[PDB]
Amino acid sequence: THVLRFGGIFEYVESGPMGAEELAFRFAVNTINRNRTLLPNTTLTYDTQKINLYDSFEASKKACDQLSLGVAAIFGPSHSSSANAVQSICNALGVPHIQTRWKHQVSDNKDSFYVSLYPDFSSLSRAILDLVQFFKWKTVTVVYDDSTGLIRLQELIKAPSRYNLRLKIRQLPADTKDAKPLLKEMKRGKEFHVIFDCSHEMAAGILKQALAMGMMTEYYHYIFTTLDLFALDVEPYRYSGVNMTGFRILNTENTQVSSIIEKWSMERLQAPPKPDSGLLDGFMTTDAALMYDAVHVVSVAVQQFPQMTVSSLQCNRHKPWRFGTRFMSLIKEAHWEGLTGRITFNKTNGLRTDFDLDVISLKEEGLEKIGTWDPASGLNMTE
Template structure:
């Protein structure tokens, strides 16, 4: 028992001894081109952040050594790695160059030192002391195959710079699912980009997979512009994860298709905070005005690499101790603790900047990447790709935009005919490839809604002609005037009289305006009745101004009551697009895949952006496959359909239960399409202008939209309906507030007159009684 208590006391008294040494050294090797770059910054910041963390490695500090080597210089790379071994590192990071990586790994493998990499490794063999965070070629090829399959490509060109890029994409045409895919391999460099693109254009290849060095991408984009391969027909799939750093300003408005994968979702709140803190670290603790917060994939992978190693150390500390040993490339004696450490690192599962991180035999599994697509204003996330699940596109319209598809249809039609006539709106995408005549009909987007139902009559509807605040003000005025009448009558000597006029010696006087009589006089005159008559000038002013007030109030009430009784009040929950966006009870949507949907999706106006976010996220979907379905949902109630005004007017004229809400949200026109340079374009435009001046187009519109409705005119009178929809509004302070001001001014005048009367009578009495005026007061 004594031994047990002694052991327990020692366990409590002696603090827990950490199983990790207080300092653990790590090394990083970068190419000279990366010196001072984003990858080195990410490495330094990750170590800094880990050392500040009180919970990750509370008793251990990471100390790093950084070495730089020339590209393609394996001898110096191995020599620098041995220098870091001599420094006493317990793990090595980098380099990202695929040629230098194997040489560094050979040194780590010989000495059982964990090698944490973030580079594309083309060797599929298992490496015992290697942990690689970069997606494997198998993962990348699977992602490219899935996106190609989704886009339904049957013919494409792969543009690569060196054999390394070709090896990376070698599995694209080896899978059975791609046996019908025609692939053209094109090797190019900055000096031959233009010629290669010209060859691709000559072969009528419109789908390209581009694998170039990031520093050469601007030359490739320049070649695209020079050869005018930047319209909707071409689609470029970039293998780089850093498309957000490309200068794509010249490509935003040409509807060219550019797609790429992304590892880092900078819109994630946690990731944004890390990137902001990294930016402050780079600026010595000061915040910069950089709002883009875009980090390169190499830098993000380097950051995650350091954190994976730190979490591995934390896991090891819970069950083992780490024994440090002096190592040397000359002795080639392996590190005994290296195998345990690499196994713990290999078991790490965390969420990093590049998404969920998990390993199997040193290679990263269960990868997840964002799919980015260049849209009219910027790059946008349109979906995700995940290992096993494949491509999940959240915005199919980004790839199969109806406006682009309509352009293709128009071009094909124009190649076979001289004219294309239909409900085709004139827009930039279509005008860039074909010609349009002058618009023969102008239109815009408007709101189709069900005709509001009549409002049921309420028991106290007689109060509707006046707003509630007016009723309250009238009540307050009634009390104020009654009290003023009472006080003024008491103050004025001319309201006091002898109740018995025949008895002249009677000194008793009375005042008819007692408190109750004052209130009775006020309410009586308001109701056009009354028995009391004021005698003094001041009280007559009070009475007169109150009569004027009641005249205005009663007349206004009577006139507005007549309007309420003769006008049918309708329940109209929305009046315009803003009302629609600020409520959630009434659903609203557009035609799926139409130009109206594209308008809201690409709009930069805040109200329309808010409406688009609502429509896009609403489940079940508020988009309809055709106009008939949209009209049907409107008639069912609690649904507003956003559609082109011409179609809307056509439906409204044929169904008394439909109406248009608000005005037009945009302005556009229908035109007749012709091939570019067609001699018919100007002639047709002149004919359209002539018909418009003569009013014949408007007469045809009236004929087919308004007059050609069978017997609908007999039971659906739009003018009557318009009158019913107009509603009488309750009078408020803005309408009759002035009469309250007149009333207050009149009461003020009455009070001043009462004071004058009192003073005059006191002066007169003081003279009669031979006393001073003040004494009489």
């Protein structure tokens, strides 16, 4: 019957195996094909290209090749520089660029052929601050990894002039093994209330150092910026009495979503897990649930545009895709219940600014839900 091709560009270091993102992409396409409610008369196909991390030149070439083969959208690469380059190309040839990861939005940048499935920083920033205020903290130490961490917490950093929060800002070193000296200063400083802004792999690492340092006890409360908090091996810490609170956008309470995350673990967990990681093996991370959701949301849009077909476009020529403008518009209007909850983009900038978070905390039983957050309600804690 009818057929439509998507492009995929996935970043990696060294060689195989496949990464979580490229895997979720493929997995979403195979699943949707078998669904008879979604794209009934339509069958999805794809080209996948692999590139080095941070080689925007290579990302450009591969994107141009794909636009030449003909594709209805490029689920372009993840990291800032390659992603900005594929986005500019996609904008010139009017093919939608689908992003899954946050990158810094420049105001005076006029690109309009992209949406981003990642929960925007502005909203996450607010939900961190909302949580802090609910715990009634007046003192807090924000610890971040790299520069862009600062930007994710700007709403929080600017609070000390409106509300009554004194706050200290510290930076992690490159390696978490180097983090004892920093933790010792916090300990002497009696900095019991701490927000860690950093990847979940950094967070697994910094917790081990915190245990070594006598800082996983009832005296300490840690808020985690990472959405992959639920991926942390928490077996070493749940008996200790520390408080760990963070957020989760992956909708694991829904039974339909749990069964999907499982089928994933079977084809994935089948491959390399690590012992000294401090992460659960075969948990579906957020980077990958978002890619899988992106392939669905875009498909909901394809259903509403049966006329559309792919064209072989050349980066040489300034001739855009006929159907681009209309397709991009359908994607931004789209609505979908996926692995990560309500998906809905912002009319204005195509950023995902409205979404639903579960709020999770460490109880002795493990990490469990204790409320919700959404930008219009603030917290809905269930005391």
